[PDB]
Amino acid sequence: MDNLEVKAKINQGLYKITPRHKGTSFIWNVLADIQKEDDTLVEGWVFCRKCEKVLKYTTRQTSNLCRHKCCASL
């Protein structure tokens, strides 16, 4: 569905990345986001800078993202 489609698009370089999310927590220290082709941030998705995995982002809660393996010992 959308997950594999956006993974392919970001792998091919259609969308750029913005490694800065302007956040207080350490979750965004090693996490990035996806920008649309018109320099607009996408909704509900996050990108990682070490293992390069796209995950669903929820505005209501971010506890699940803390369980990501790349953030094990950070």
Partner DNA sequence: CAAGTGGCGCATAAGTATCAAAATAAGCCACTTGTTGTTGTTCTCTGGTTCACGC
Which residue's CB is nearer to DNA, number 20 or number 53? 20
- 8 A C-beta contact, residue 34 and residue 47: yes
Q: Does 66 bind DNA (CB under 7 A)?
A: yes
Q: Does 62 bind DNA (CB under 7 A)?
A: yes
Tell whether residue 48 is among the known ligand binding residues. yes
Cα(35)–Cα(38) distance, rounded to whole angstroms?
A: 8
Please report, to the nearest 10 degrees, the dihedral formed by the alpha carbons of residues 59, 50, 9, 19 taken in order: 60
Footprint of DNA (CB under 7 A): 23-28, 59-64, 66
Write out the binding residues for Zn(2+): 48, 51, 68, 70
